[PDB]
Amino acid sequence: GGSVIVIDSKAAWDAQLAKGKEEHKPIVVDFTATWCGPCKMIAPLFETLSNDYAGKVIFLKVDVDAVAAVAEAAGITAMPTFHVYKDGVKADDLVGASQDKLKALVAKHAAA
């Protein structure tokens, strides 16, 4: 929902990472699963933040069931896991469903 872009393939993943690098905009990614309780608790905030920061931060969703190869390359072991990507590469991460920590992560990387 919101301004979150759902990733459906490795090809789409690569293309979004490439666009964030060209646009010089940070990317925040939610690695998630619909069987995971904490994922369901935090997804509304991820969506709201995607609206609030639309234009400053790009928001992607990777369902680990839908794109296991992208989940594997990201080294995920618990969910939700949030990654920040800048200039094509992982810059930061945050594991778990803390609302304050997710807000702080987006603000940190949106201030540039």
Author numbering: 1 to 112
Sentences from the paper on this structure:
Thioredoxins (TRXs) are small oxidoreductases that contribute, in most living organisms, to the control of cellular redox homeostasis. Indeed, they reduce disulfide bonds on numerous proteins involved in several processes, including antioxidant defense mechanisms, photosynthetic carbon metabolism, and protein folding. In addition, TRXs have been suggested to control two additional Cys-based post-translational modifications, namely S-glutathionylation and S-nitrosylation, by catalyzing the reduction of glutathione-mixed disulfides (–SSGs) and S-nitrosothiols (–SNOs), respectively. The redox activity of TRXs relies on the presence of two Cys residues in the conserved Trp-Cys-(Gly/Pro)-Pro-Cys (WC(G/P)PC) active site motif.
In the present study, we deepen the structural features of CrTRXh1, providing the 3D structures of both the reduced form and variants in which catalytic cysteines were mutated. Structural alignments and circular dichroism (CD) analysis of reduced and oxidized CrTRXh1 reveal an identical folding independent on the redox state. Through mass spectrometry (MS) analysis coupled to pH-dependent iodoacetamide (IAM)-based alkylation, we experimentally determined the pKa of both active site cysteines.
